Amino acid sequence: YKEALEAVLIKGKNGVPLLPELYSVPPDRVDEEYQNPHTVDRVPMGKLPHMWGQSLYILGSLMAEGFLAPGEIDPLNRRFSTVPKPD
Amino acid sequence: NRQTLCSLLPRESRSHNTDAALLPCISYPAFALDDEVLFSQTLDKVVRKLKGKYGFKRFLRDGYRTSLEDPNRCYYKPAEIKLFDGIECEFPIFFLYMMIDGVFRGNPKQVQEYQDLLTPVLHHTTEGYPVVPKYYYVPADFVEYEKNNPGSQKRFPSNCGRDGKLFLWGQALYIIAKLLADELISPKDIDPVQRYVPLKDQRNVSMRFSNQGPLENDLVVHVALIAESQRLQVFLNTYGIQTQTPQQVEPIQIWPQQELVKAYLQLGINEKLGLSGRPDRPIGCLGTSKIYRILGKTVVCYPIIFDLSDFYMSQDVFLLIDDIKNALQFIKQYWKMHGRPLFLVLIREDNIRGSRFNPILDMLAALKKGIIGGVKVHVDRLQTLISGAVVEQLDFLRISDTEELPEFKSFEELEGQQPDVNISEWKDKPTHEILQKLNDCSCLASQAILLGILLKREGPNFITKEGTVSDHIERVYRRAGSQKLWLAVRYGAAFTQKFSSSIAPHITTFLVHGKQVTLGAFGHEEE
Amino acid sequence: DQQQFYLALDNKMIVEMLRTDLSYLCSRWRMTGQPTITFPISHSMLDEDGTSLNSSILAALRKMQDGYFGGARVQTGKLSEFLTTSC
C-alpha cells in the first residue's frame, strides 16, 4: 500500500507529495469501465491535497520509517483490542 | 552525602566535637547546612568553644604551631594532645568568615562586632595595606599562665607584614569580607548559583527545597504497578488491582538498574585522559525515580528493591512490602527535584504464589487507596505518569555518536520437615558414600549441603548430573528462593559467597551515627 | 425491577433473563475486579403458598453455588467478601 500510494501521489510545489482526494473516471471513458472494471486511467480530482488523507500519509510515513511507534500515537493501547480476553 | 553530613553534625568528626573548619562548610562559600536548627546549634558550639579575641581556634587541643609542639616531628604521641588545651592558636581568618556569614544572613550587628574583633588583630604593611595573620600563638613563656586562665595573655602574630610573609588565604578572605561589608559586592554577586538561600526556601533542585519548602514534606510519589506476565496482569485484574505488563507500556522501556549503570558507564569517557566514566555502582531510589531518555527511547528503571540478584531477602514478600514502604518513605524524605518521583512496583509470580498472595495485595490496595506508610502515592498508568515529567536526557550516549550502541535489555514479559540429616552426622563421616547419600536423601537443603561439600572437596567446577557444581548450586539457590524452604536459600547464598551492594553503605550508615560494628559469631573471631 | 413492567413478576423469566445476563457479563466485562451481581430474593419469587421458594428460582440459586450458570463462572458468596474483588 506504500508503493500503490506513491504512484497516485501527485507531485506539486517544490516536489512535495500531495494526496489526491479522489481519482475520477474521464467522461468519455465511463463506458469502458462499465464493461471492464478497474482498468481505465483515472484523473485526479477533488481536493488537492486532501488534508485529511495527507495527514495519515505522513503519520503512516512517520511510523513506517521508525520516527514513531504505534504506542506513542495510541497511548491508550487501543491496538490490543483484538487480543483474546478470558471470560 | 547529605545523610553523612546530617549524622556527623553538629560534630565535625568522631574526634572533634567541633571544628573551625565547619565555619566554611555551614557558611560561605558552601552553606552546606540547610536545617536551620542544625545550623544554629552547630554555630553555637563553634563560637562557644573556639571563639577568642585573637581569632578562632581550629579545634580543641590543637598542637599546630603551638609552643609545646615539636616542629621536626610530623606526628603527635597519644600523651601529647593533653598539653594543647587552652593554648590553641587562634586564627583571625574566621573573624572574616563570620563577617561574611553576617553579611550573607543579613545581621549587620554580627558584621560590626566581628570587624571590631578583627581590627585589633589586623596588621599592616609599610604601605598601609592590612595583613590578616594566619594565627595568633601564645608565647612559649606565657603557656602556663594561658593554661591557668585562657585568653589572659597576649598572643604573637604568625604573620605581621614587613616580614615578607603574607597569609594569602587570609588576605583574600579579607578582601571578600571587606567588599561585602562595604556593600561594594552583593552576596548574590559572589554567589551567582545560590548556595545561601534565605528562609524563602523553595524550588531548589537537590537542595532539600521541594515545592512545599523546608518544613512540609507531603510528597506524592508516582507509582506504576507493573506485572511480570500477562497471566499475572489478568489475575491481579480479577482481584481489583490494575497492572500493566512491560508490553502494555510499549514505547517506554522498563529497565533493571543494571542497565542504567551500563548506560551511565559512557558518561565522562575521555580516552585522551584515560578516564573510564561512571563507576559501576547501583543506582538507587532517587536515581531510579527519575525518567530517563536514552537514544530517543524513554526508560524507567524499577527500584533496586525488586532485583532478585543481589540477595535473597526480596524473595520474602513481607520484606518486599516493608522494602516498598521504606523506599517510598525514603523518596518522600529525600526526593527534592522539580518533577514528581516515579516508583515502578514490580509484581512477580513468586511474590504471589501461595499464602504470599494476601500481603502483596494488601500493599497494592493501600497503594490504590493513595496512601501507604504515610506516603502519598499516585497509582496510575505509566503513560500518564511519564507525560509532563522532566526527563533526564543521557546525551553522552549520542555525542560520541554511539547511536548504534547495543540495545539495552529492557524488562521482558513472561510469555516439609525438620532436617533429617544433622550437620555432625555426616560431616564426621570420613568415608565418601555421602555422594550416594545425596541421591538417597530428598531434601533440597540436603542437596545444597552436598554440593557445597562437592565444591569444596571436589574442586570448584566439578560436573554433576545437572551440570557443573557451581551452576547447579546457583540453580538450587534459585529454586530454594521459589518454594520457600529457606534452609537451602541461605546455604546456597553462603556457599556461593553471596553479597549485596547495600551492605557496605549500611555499615557506613551504622558507623556515621556513632555505632561501631563487629561482624563475627559469638565465641569466634570478630572483625 | 417490578415497578416498571411485568417481566420481573414471572419467576421463570427471572432465571431466563438472569441466564443471559450472566452470559452477557462473563463475555463482556472489561473492568478491574470481578463483576458482582447482588441478587435479592423477593416475596414474589416465592411460591403461591408463600412458604416455599419457586422451583425455577430454586434451581437457579443452587445452580450458582456449584459455580456454573448460563455459561458463566459464578463464585457465590456474601457481599462483604466481594468488597476487595470488585470494581
Side-chain angles (χ1 to χ4, degrees):
Chain A
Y1 299 106
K2 155 147 65 182
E3 310 334 331
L5 188 65
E6 241 164 71
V8 317
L9 276 143
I10 291 295
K11 278 187 298 299
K13 303 308 294 132
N14 45 47
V16 298
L18 287 306
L19 185 132
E21 156 170 280
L22 49 96
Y23 272 89
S24 208
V25 202
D28 60 334
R29 266 160 101 113
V30 297
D31 321 321
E32 328 183 358
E33 197 172 1
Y34 264 109
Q35 268 87 70
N36 162 341
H38 297 154
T39 44
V40 316
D41 253 349
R42 289 169 183 240
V43 84
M45 308 270 300
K47 282 193 272 233
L48 201 279
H50 189 240
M51 216 166 261
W52 170 357
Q54 180 98 11
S55 158
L56 316 102
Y57 160 65
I58 309 165
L59 192 57
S61 291
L62 283 178
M63 276 177 348
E65 286 71 89
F67 296 104
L68 219 70
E72 280 196 31
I73 209 59
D74 198 325
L76 294 163
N77 300 329
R78 305 224 36 80
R79 43 197 211 285
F80 302 140
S81 100
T82 42
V83 317
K85 314 60 160 180
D87 279 15
Chain B
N1 276 311
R2 82 153 326 161
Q3 330 201 279
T4 320
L5 177 75
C6 292
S7 294
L8 256 301
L9 281 180
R11 311 191 80 227
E12 156 99 6
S13 323
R14 241 190 274 155
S15 306
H16 303 166
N17 34 36
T18 183
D19 194 314
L22 281 174
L23 215 31
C25 164
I26 48 63
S27 183
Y28 182 88
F31 304 99
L33 251 194
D34 161 346
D35 190 13
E36 314 292 331
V37 193
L38 191 48
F39 168 76
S40 293
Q41 187 190 13
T42 303
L43 203 52
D44 290 45
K45 302 174 67 174
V46 173
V47 176
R48 273 177 343 120
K49 307 190 69 59
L50 314 173
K51 190 187 149 320
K53 63 159 306 299
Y54 286 97
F56 274 56
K57 297 175 272 300
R58 288 189 334 178
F59 57 77
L60 289 323
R61 317 207 190 208
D62 174 40
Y64 171 67
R65 295 300 190 270
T66 52
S67 147
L68 289 188
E69 162 224 6
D70 321 329
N72 322 328
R73 282 197 294 104
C74 55
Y75 80 102
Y76 293 0
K77 293 179 179 179
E80 217 172 30
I81 37 70
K82 65 155 148 323
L83 293 173
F84 299 131
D85 86 340
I87 59 132
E88 301 104 343
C89 324
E90 261 153 27
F91 284 61
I93 201 184
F94 300 106
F95 287 170
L96 299 160
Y97 271 121
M98 287 274 282
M99 222 182 316
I100 301 169
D101 190 25
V103 176
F104 259 81
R105 298 185 166 37
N107 59 356
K109 278 327 294 145
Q110 184 180 340
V111 189
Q112 240 308 348
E113 99 182 22
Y114 255 117
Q115 180 111 21
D116 298 345
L117 296 214
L118 183 85
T119 296
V121 278
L122 292 165
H123 275 220
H124 291 90
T125 36
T126 58
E127 296 115 14
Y129 309 140
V131 173
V132 176
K134 189 178 180 182
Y135 56 87
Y136 273 91
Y137 60 94
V138 317
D141 74 314
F142 291 31
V143 289
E144 182 201 5
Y145 296 138
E146 185 68 26
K147 280 181 162 185
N148 308 350
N149 191 349
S152 45
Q153 313 292 128
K154 175 186 176 182
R155 292 187 177 235
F156 291 159
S158 34
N159 314 140
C160 160
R162 338 164 197 282
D163 291 29
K165 296 141 55 189
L166 300 191
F167 184 38
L168 269 39
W169 174 16
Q171 279 292 11
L173 211 70
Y174 177 72
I175 286 302
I176 305 166
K178 278 326 274 288
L179 286 171
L180 289 156
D182 193 29
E183 292 233 353
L184 295 175
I185 69 184
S186 203
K188 194 184 339 291
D189 284 27
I190 45 143
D191 212 1
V193 74
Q194 298 135 296
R195 286 301 316 158
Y196 181 78
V197 201
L199 302 163
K200 323 160 191 315
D201 273 327
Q202 312 160 122
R203 190 82 22 63
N204 315 41
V205 317
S206 267
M207 219 177 149
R208 186 235 184 194
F209 307 144
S210 100
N211 41 8
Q212 314 162 25
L215 319 178
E216 295 317 69
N217 192 31
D218 184 1
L219 176 52
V220 178
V221 190
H222 285 159
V223 169
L225 279 41
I226 311 287
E228 258 191 307
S229 177
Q230 184 53 108
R231 295 176 64 186
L232 224 44
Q233 190 243 352
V234 305
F235 148 60
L236 264 184
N237 190 332
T238 174
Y239 281 81
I241 279 43
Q242 225 186 346
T243 39
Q244 293 184 338
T245 47
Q247 290 203 348
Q248 284 186 21
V249 212
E250 237 297 300
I252 311 169
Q253 312 294 164
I254 300 164
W255 278 14
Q257 64 180 20
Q258 321 157 358
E259 254 70 19
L260 197 71
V261 188
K262 260 270 316 175
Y264 266 117
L265 284 176
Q266 264 69 240
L267 169 48
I269 276 301
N270 214 162
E271 266 70 42
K272 268 189 280 142
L273 278 167
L275 291 172
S276 70
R278 202 180 163 260
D280 12 79
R281 162 186 57 180
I283 270 122
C285 261
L286 289 193
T288 58
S289 286
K290 264 198 299 283
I291 283 151
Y292 300 87
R293 165 97 38 71
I294 288 129
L295 294 186
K297 295 187 125 18
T298 316
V299 343
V300 285
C301 306
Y302 44 84
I304 187 43
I305 79 181
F306 294 111
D307 251 351
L308 281 204
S309 304
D310 311 300
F311 213 49
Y312 72 107
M313 273 168 320
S314 44
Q315 261 81 342
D316 208 6
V317 310
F318 291 95
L319 285 201
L320 192 74
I321 278 44
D322 318 59
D323 269 8
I324 296 163
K325 275 159 98 30
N326 277 216
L328 285 182
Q329 273 138 30
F330 170 104
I331 300 171
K332 183 199 202 263
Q333 213 183 333
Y334 293 110
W335 177 264
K336 305 280 163 303
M337 305 273 273
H338 184 53
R340 294 222 291 225
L342 188 163
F343 193 80
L344 291 96
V345 167
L346 200 63
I347 302 325
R348 311 178 167 281
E349 307 83 326
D350 298 323
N351 299 327
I352 288 266
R353 292 202 31 167
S355 60
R356 298 107 71 168
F357 170 53
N358 216 255
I360 191 174
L361 257 77
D362 267 32
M363 159 256 309
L364 289 170
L367 291 168
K368 183 166 38 33
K369 203 181 148 211
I371 294 200
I372 193 172
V375 170
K376 289 188 185 182
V377 313
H378 184 232
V379 178
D380 202 20
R381 308 209 302 149
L382 195 46
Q383 284 92 347
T384 79
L385 257 56
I386 202 174
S387 316
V390 173
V391 86
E392 175 79 76
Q393 248 270 37
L394 290 76
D395 311 335
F396 45 88
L397 287 180
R398 198 163 280 253
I399 67 180
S400 36
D401 266 14
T402 56
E403 313 185 349
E404 66 266 8
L405 214 58
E407 56 101 357
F408 303 84
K409 299 313 292 172
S410 53
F411 197 60
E412 197 83 2
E413 197 221 301
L414 204 58
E415 301 169 359
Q417 55 145 337
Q418 302 294 306
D420 61 273
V421 157
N422 289 341
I423 318 176
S424 60
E425 276 178 358
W426 288 94
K427 171 220 314 174
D428 187 75
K429 198 74 134 57
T431 171
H432 192 293
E433 50 278 61
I434 194 166
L435 189 34
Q436 299 104 69
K437 182 51 192 176
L438 157 71
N439 317 324
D440 295 349
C441 200
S442 192
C443 304
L444 256 187
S446 294
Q447 267 100 46
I449 305 176
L450 268 276
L451 276 90
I453 292 201
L454 267 38
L455 132 143
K456 289 175 62 173
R457 145 166 319 179
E458 293 296 329
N461 275 9
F462 199 24
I463 43 179
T464 340
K465 312 156 281 193
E466 295 191 22
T468 81
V469 168
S470 190
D471 74 359
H472 165 291
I473 267 240
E474 295 165 337
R475 166 159 150 190
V476 166
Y477 160 70
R478 292 301 302 126
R479 176 80 170 105
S482 40
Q483 78 264 327
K484 292 282 228 234
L485 279 163
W486 306 51
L487 288 305
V489 82
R490 292 165 191 283
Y491 283 26
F495 286 36
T496 336
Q497 320 263 321
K498 183 96 213 92
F499 174 81
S500 100
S501 300
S502 35
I503 295 144
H506 272 135
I507 293 144
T508 308
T509 313
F510 306 157
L511 221 49
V512 299
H513 289 112
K515 314 297 189 38
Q516 186 276 339
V517 189
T518 80
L519 269 156
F522 182 167
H524 291 39
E525 32 160 27
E526 40 180 349
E527 187 107 7
Chain C
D1 155 20
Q2 309 210 15
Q3 331 289 328
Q4 183 174 135
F5 213 70
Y6 47 84
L7 292 203
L9 270 165
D10 189 42
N11 326 298
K12 248 205 167 44
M13 200 78 189
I14 319 308
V15 189
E16 148 71 77
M17 303 207 271
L18 181 49
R19 201 207 318 281
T20 59
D21 257 34
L22 306 201
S23 323
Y24 181 59
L25 243 187
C26 58
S27 51
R28 265 141 158 161
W29 185 253
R30 307 289 180 279
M31 276 132 273
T32 206
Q34 272 173 177
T36 325
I37 287 200
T38 160
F39 195 68
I41 284 304
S42 302
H43 211 291
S44 212
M45 330 192 42
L46 294 174
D47 266 344
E48 299 294 326
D49 300 349
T51 65
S52 147
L53 207 171
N54 163 332
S55 298
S56 167
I57 314 280
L58 194 279
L61 301 210
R62 305 129 92 81
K63 211 89 57 63
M64 292 197 270
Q65 333 210 308
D66 298 290
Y68 178 117
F69 179 43
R73 209 145 144 81
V74 172
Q75 192 159 132
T76 316
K78 286 171 303 293
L79 216 46
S80 294
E81 303 176 350
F82 301 135
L83 249 183
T84 56
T85 80
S86 281
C87 195

PDB file of all heavy atoms in Angstrom, chain A residues 71 75-77 79-80, chain B residues 247-248 250-251 381 383:
ATOM      1  N   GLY A  71       2.476   2.774  19.908  1.00  0.00           N
ATOM      2  CA  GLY A  71       2.056   3.116  21.256  1.00  0.00           C
ATOM      3  C   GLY A  71       2.059   4.609  21.526  1.00  0.00           C
ATOM      4  O   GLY A  71       1.273   5.100  22.339  1.00  0.00           O
ATOM      5  N   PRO A  75      -1.502   5.977  22.924  1.00  0.00           N
ATOM      6  CA  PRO A  75      -1.076   5.782  24.319  1.00  0.00           C
ATOM      7  C   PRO A  75      -2.087   5.038  25.169  1.00  0.00           C
ATOM      8  O   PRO A  75      -1.714   4.511  26.224  1.00  0.00           O
ATOM      9  CB  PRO A  75      -0.872   7.216  24.818  1.00  0.00           C
ATOM     10  CG  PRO A  75      -1.843   7.997  24.012  1.00  0.00           C
ATOM     11  CD  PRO A  75      -1.774   7.394  22.640  1.00  0.00           C
ATOM     12  N   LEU A  76      -3.346   4.976  24.749  1.00  0.00           N
ATOM     13  CA  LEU A  76      -4.388   4.283  25.488  1.00  0.00           C
ATOM     14  C   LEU A  76      -4.462   2.804  25.133  1.00  0.00           C
ATOM     15  O   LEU A  76      -5.346   2.101  25.631  1.00  0.00           O
ATOM     16  CB  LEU A  76      -5.733   4.965  25.246  1.00  0.00           C
ATOM     17  CG  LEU A  76      -5.810   6.380  25.822  1.00  0.00           C
ATOM     18  CD1 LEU A  76      -6.956   7.151  25.215  1.00  0.00           C
ATOM     19  CD2 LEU A  76      -5.950   6.329  27.330  1.00  0.00           C
ATOM     20  N   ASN A  77      -3.554   2.326  24.282  1.00  0.00           N
ATOM     21  CA  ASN A  77      -3.435   0.910  23.941  1.00  0.00           C
ATOM     22  C   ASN A  77      -4.736   0.361  23.362  1.00  0.00           C
ATOM     23  O   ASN A  77      -5.245  -0.680  23.781  1.00  0.00           O
ATOM     24  CB  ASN A  77      -2.986   0.091  25.151  1.00  0.00           C
ATOM     25  CG  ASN A  77      -1.644   0.534  25.689  1.00  0.00           C
ATOM     26  OD1 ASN A  77      -0.789   1.007  24.942  1.00  0.00           O
ATOM     27  ND2 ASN A  77      -1.452   0.389  26.994  1.00  0.00           N
ATOM     28  N   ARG A  79      -4.761  -0.568  20.242  1.00  0.00           N
ATOM     29  CA  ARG A  79      -4.295  -1.546  19.268  1.00  0.00           C
ATOM     30  C   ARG A  79      -4.387  -2.976  19.777  1.00  0.00           C
ATOM     31  O   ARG A  79      -4.353  -3.906  18.965  1.00  0.00           O
ATOM     32  CB  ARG A  79      -2.852  -1.239  18.872  1.00  0.00           C
ATOM     33  CG  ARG A  79      -1.961  -0.874  20.043  1.00  0.00           C
ATOM     34  CD  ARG A  79      -0.688  -0.185  19.590  1.00  0.00           C
ATOM     35  NE  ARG A  79       0.427  -0.462  20.486  1.00  0.00           N
ATOM     36  CZ  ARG A  79       0.585   0.087  21.682  1.00  0.00           C
ATOM     37  NH1 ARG A  79      -0.281   0.964  22.162  1.00  0.00           N
ATOM     38  NH2 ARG A  79       1.639  -0.254  22.418  1.00  0.00           N
ATOM     39  N   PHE A  80      -4.502  -3.175  21.089  1.00  0.00           N
ATOM     40  CA  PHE A  80      -4.599  -4.501  21.681  1.00  0.00           C
ATOM     41  C   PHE A  80      -6.047  -4.929  21.887  1.00  0.00           C
ATOM     42  O   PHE A  80      -6.314  -5.846  22.669  1.00  0.00           O
ATOM     43  CB  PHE A  80      -3.840  -4.542  23.007  1.00  0.00           C
ATOM     44  CG  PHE A  80      -2.389  -4.179  22.885  1.00  0.00           C
ATOM     45  CD1 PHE A  80      -1.779  -3.390  23.843  1.00  0.00           C
ATOM     46  CD2 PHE A  80      -1.635  -4.631  21.816  1.00  0.00           C
ATOM     47  CE1 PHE A  80      -0.444  -3.056  23.736  1.00  0.00           C
ATOM     48  CE2 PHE A  80      -0.301  -4.300  21.704  1.00  0.00           C
ATOM     49  CZ  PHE A  80       0.296  -3.511  22.666  1.00  0.00           C
TER      50      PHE A  80
ATOM     51  N   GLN B 247       4.830  -4.861  28.112  1.00  0.00           N
ATOM     52  CA  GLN B 247       4.392  -4.688  26.742  1.00  0.00           C
ATOM     53  C   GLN B 247       3.251  -3.757  26.593  1.00  0.00           C
ATOM     54  O   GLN B 247       2.895  -3.379  25.491  1.00  0.00           O
ATOM     55  CB  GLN B 247       3.974  -6.040  26.165  1.00  0.00           C
ATOM     56  CG  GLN B 247       5.138  -6.985  25.944  1.00  0.00           C
ATOM     57  CD  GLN B 247       4.832  -8.040  24.904  1.00  0.00           C
ATOM     58  OE1 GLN B 247       3.683  -8.211  24.499  1.00  0.00           O
ATOM     59  NE2 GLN B 247       5.861  -8.755  24.465  1.00  0.00           N
ATOM     60  N   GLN B 248       2.634  -3.394  27.681  1.00  0.00           N
ATOM     61  CA  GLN B 248       1.486  -2.574  27.604  1.00  0.00           C
ATOM     62  C   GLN B 248       1.921  -1.166  27.799  1.00  0.00           C
ATOM     63  O   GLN B 248       1.092  -0.275  27.849  1.00  0.00           O
ATOM     64  CB  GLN B 248       0.532  -2.992  28.667  1.00  0.00           C
ATOM     65  CG  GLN B 248      -0.215  -4.270  28.365  1.00  0.00           C
ATOM     66  CD  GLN B 248      -1.263  -4.576  29.409  1.00  0.00           C
ATOM     67  OE1 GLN B 248      -1.706  -3.694  30.138  1.00  0.00           O
ATOM     68  NE2 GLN B 248      -1.665  -5.827  29.484  1.00  0.00           N
ATOM     69  N   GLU B 250       4.532   0.246  25.832  1.00  0.00           N
ATOM     70  CA  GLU B 250       5.369  -0.366  24.850  1.00  0.00           C
ATOM     71  C   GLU B 250       6.430   0.568  24.367  1.00  0.00           C
ATOM     72  O   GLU B 250       7.594   0.181  24.283  1.00  0.00           O
ATOM     73  CB  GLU B 250       4.792  -1.141  23.703  1.00  0.00           C
ATOM     74  CG  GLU B 250       5.282  -2.576  23.618  1.00  0.00           C
ATOM     75  CD  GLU B 250       6.772  -2.688  23.383  1.00  0.00           C
ATOM     76  OE1 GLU B 250       7.256  -2.177  22.350  1.00  0.00           O
ATOM     77  OE2 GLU B 250       7.461  -3.300  24.225  1.00  0.00           O
ATOM     78  N   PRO B 251       6.081   1.796  24.059  1.00  0.00           N
ATOM     79  CA  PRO B 251       7.233   2.585  23.647  1.00  0.00           C
ATOM     80  C   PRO B 251       8.197   2.731  24.833  1.00  0.00           C
ATOM     81  O   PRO B 251       9.392   2.709  24.633  1.00  0.00           O
ATOM     82  CB  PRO B 251       6.623   3.869  23.148  1.00  0.00           C
ATOM     83  CG  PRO B 251       5.236   3.910  23.699  1.00  0.00           C
ATOM     84  CD  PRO B 251       4.809   2.485  23.812  1.00  0.00           C
ATOM     85  N   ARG B 381      -1.560   4.832  35.245  1.00  0.00           N
ATOM     86  CA  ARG B 381      -0.846   4.213  34.139  1.00  0.00           C
ATOM     87  C   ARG B 381       0.521   4.862  33.959  1.00  0.00           C
ATOM     88  O   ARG B 381       0.719   6.042  34.260  1.00  0.00           O
ATOM     89  CB  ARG B 381      -1.653   4.335  32.849  1.00  0.00           C
ATOM     90  CG  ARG B 381      -3.086   3.844  32.952  1.00  0.00           C
ATOM     91  CD  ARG B 381      -3.563   3.333  31.609  1.00  0.00           C
ATOM     92  NE  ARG B 381      -3.468   4.364  30.584  1.00  0.00           N
ATOM     93  CZ  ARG B 381      -3.242   4.121  29.302  1.00  0.00           C
ATOM     94  NH1 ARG B 381      -3.107   2.887  28.845  1.00  0.00           N
ATOM     95  NH2 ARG B 381      -3.138   5.143  28.457  1.00  0.00           N
ATOM     96  N   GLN B 383       1.934   5.571  31.206  1.00  0.00           N
ATOM     97  CA  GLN B 383       1.903   6.561  30.135  1.00  0.00           C
ATOM     98  C   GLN B 383       1.512   7.935  30.665  1.00  0.00           C
ATOM     99  O   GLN B 383       2.044   8.955  30.212  1.00  0.00           O
ATOM    100  CB  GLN B 383       0.943   6.108  29.037  1.00  0.00           C
ATOM    101  CG  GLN B 383       1.505   5.009  28.150  1.00  0.00           C
ATOM    102  CD  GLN B 383       1.152   3.624  28.649  1.00  0.00           C
ATOM    103  OE1 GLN B 383       0.684   3.458  29.774  1.00  0.00           O
ATOM    104  NE2 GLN B 383       1.369   2.620  27.809  1.00  0.00           N
TER     105      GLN B 383
END
